[PDB]
Structure 1
Amino acid sequence: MKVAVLPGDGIGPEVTEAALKVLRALDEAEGLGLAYEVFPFGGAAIDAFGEPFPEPTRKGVEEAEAVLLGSVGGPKWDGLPRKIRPETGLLSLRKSQDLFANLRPAKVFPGLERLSPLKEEIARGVDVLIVRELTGGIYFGEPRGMSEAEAWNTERYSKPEVERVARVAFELARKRRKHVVSVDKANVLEVGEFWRKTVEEVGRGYPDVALEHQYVDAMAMHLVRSPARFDVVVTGNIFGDILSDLASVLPGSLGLLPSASLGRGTPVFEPVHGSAPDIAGKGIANPTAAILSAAMMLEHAFGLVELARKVEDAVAKALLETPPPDLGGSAGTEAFTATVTATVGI
């Protein structure tokens, strides 16, 4: 269990350490042989090496089995050349490991339905995993450009690209509730027909997984109307950007959202939240997102499904009995973390 830890900026370092205390207690009580090394990344790397992704950290991630990343970026570096700013580092890390599938789950823990913008009866049970293609689509498609008279961008997709995301989505569904919803705009766009047909062929190799297809517009309605019926959802870059943000509001607090990036190389698990400079080091930060990110790591990097679920359960229990400030509670980083460990240990 080789973990390259990239704590990052702002509250990253401290929430990441919260996640590590949880892992260290699990590894100690169950003997998981966890081994990790922390490497400089983000602004932290910029300030100590002149760039976001320094060689040592590059090698550090190649050699690890998984990467636990904290928050990256902050006002202190947003004014540097694009090619050396934090967000850039994330670009080169993802690319160095050929990561093409962004994993964004959204789950309403039992008893926390009240937090949802949705009515209670419709929030209950939500547990959807949104898989978003990262390497291509209109976000990268060419030609792109703009004149004084007009602008253009191209939504382009190759079969290999759709195929790899699709595969990851089916695999994921297997170890889940065996359902996959592939979302596209096939009723009007060629790339939607192509995507649809590709995901269809690929799904043939996964008979044990029920494959449903829906349109993006229809999907947006479905995630507010009845999100609880979906398990895994896969779709291209932009629709994936929109659908995961949509699903992200379902639970009701950003500080809970974990995330993962799977690909050909080393998998990256990190919180969705930002660095939150103004509260860094004040021990207020809700570590939930980083912990759940460590939980996603256990499961997807090391196939420890049951234990991961054990960590998730414990954090769900903690947000109920000792909620952190952002949930209207008074449990700070340190205290919340102990609660989670307890609920894991008991």
Structure 2
Amino acid sequence: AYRICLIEGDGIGHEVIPAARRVLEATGLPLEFVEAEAGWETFERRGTSVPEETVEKILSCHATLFGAATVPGFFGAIRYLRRRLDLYANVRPAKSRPVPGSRPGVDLVIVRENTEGLYVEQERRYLDVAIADAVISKKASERIGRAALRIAEGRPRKTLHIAHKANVLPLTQGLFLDTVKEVAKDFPLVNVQDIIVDNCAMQLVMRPERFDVIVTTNLLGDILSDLAAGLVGGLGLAPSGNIGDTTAVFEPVHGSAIAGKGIANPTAAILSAAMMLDYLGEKEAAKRVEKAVDLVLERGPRTPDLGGDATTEAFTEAVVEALKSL
């Protein structure tokens, strides 16, 4: 059976992760769970955001699902995990959901590298001048390009756009662009197009339907993904994954927010669980989960963040029920 490590994290995480677990069990898949701790609240009790035991648990499982995160000695749990486990592929999908305030027809995935697994981009200040290093290496570019190509090859469109800034940064961005295009020769089935990041941002706003998979570098991926989230309902419903060569951690994009009341929308956590299923090779199960979520978002109840007043537990129940009817 699949071993899934569950980490609630802080605040709303305590509500959306158990919800995600519920939906996962509803799929009927042979699943096992291992609870672990991480985050600010874990720091206050353990002295560290990511206890050594947590890393061990993560490594003992096929995949990890993380809820949310919210001083000397403290460090970002997710940032630490990316570096410690070299989860180099940051995967952020943007898909139209049947919710008021969402552009229809949008269905893309943005892939960018999590650099710290290989190196930390250093900042330095000398008197009145501060300098930040933007680093691109052939190795890192080959890895993320191959990761993006595989993702595109597993999607209907078989289309990949390389969003770059080689026009103004020929050495760094050019190395990125050229390397991804080189790796692309190994994926003749994938249609690869190059696009300046600025133009990509404008086209995401004007006609996002144009994109399927987009691969880009660090700082650019961030803004493009947030721009895209703005088009389909905000970060509130956005799932994400951090995939390495041995394991992966999935989590909602938005912070830990409210909370405690039980009005947190578990959509992102559930869709992150769906991303995890896809990653594990259970694509059909992932599609059913996603469908069930859409059905509820469309007809079923709705949590506060979506105009409704339904509770996290109520919304989750509907999904479970809907999932069972599919």
TM-score by length of 2: 0.94
Of 129, 145, 164, 1:184 maps to: 164
Cα deviation digits, residues 166-200 of structure 1 (max 9, x gap):
01101111111311111111122121221111011
**1:136 Cα deviation from its structure 2 partner:** 5.9
Matched, 1:304 2:279: no
Matched, 1:97 2:85: yes
Matched, 1:217 2:205: no
Please give the residue correspondences for 1:38-53 in structure 2 after superposition, counting only pairs within 5 Å.
38-53=35-50
Which blocks of at least 5 consecutive residues in structure 1 are unaligned?
A: 74-79, 117-122
**1:292 Cα deviation from its structure 2 partner:** 0.5
Matched, 1:124 2:110: no
**1:43 Cα deviation from its structure 2 partner:** 2.2
Provide the residue aligned with 2:113 in structure 1.
133
Paired residue type of 2:214 = V
Provide the residue aligned with 1:239 in structure 2.
220
**1:140 Cα deviation from its structure 2 partner:** 3.9
Distance 1:43 1:240 in 2: 26
**1:91 Cα deviation from its structure 2 partner:** 2.0
Please give the residue correspondences for 1:153-164 in structure 2 after superposition, counting only pairs within 5 Å.
153-164=132-143
Matched, 1:198 2:179: yes
Greater shift in the superposed pair: 287-296 or 254-263: 254-263
Provide the residue aligned with 1:26 in structure 2.
27
Q: What is the root-mean-square deviation in Å for CA atoms of aligned residues?
A: 1.6
Paired residue type of 1:130 = I
Distance 1:21 1:208 in 2: 38
Paired residue type of 1:311 = V
Distance 2:234 2:304 in 1: 11
- Aligned-residue identity in percent: 45
Conserved? CA contact 1:255–1:287, under 8 Å: no
Please give the residue correspondences for 1:247-258 in structure 2 after superposition, counting only pairs within 5 Å.
247-258=228-239
Cα deviation digits, residues 42-63 of structure 1 (max 9, x gap):
1232233211111211100111
SS of structure 1 residue aligned to 2:263 = coil
Matched, 1:37 2:34: yes
Conserved? CA contact 1:130–1:232, under 8 Å: yes
Distance 1:264 1:287 in 2: 28
Distance 1:253 1:324 in 2: 14
Paired residue type of 1:151 = A
Which blocks of at least 5 consecutive residues in structure 2 are unaligned?
A: none
Cα deviation digits, residues 114-166 of structure 1 (max 9, x gap):
413xxxxxx221011011111169x9434x32233322222221100000000
Provide the residue aligned with 2:264 in structure 1.
285
Cα deviation digits, residues 282-337 of structure 1 (max 9, x gap):
1111000100010000001x111121011111101111121211110122101100
Conserved? CA contact 1:172–1:232, under 8 Å: yes
Provide the residue aligned with 1:57 in structure 2.
54
SS of structure 2 residue aligned to 1:99 = coil
Distance 2:318 2:290 in 1: 13
Conserved? CA contact 2:136–2:173, under 8 Å: no
TM-score by length of 1: 0.89
Distance 1:345 1:160 in 2: 44
Distance 2:276 2:150 in 1: 16
Q: How many residues align?
A: 320
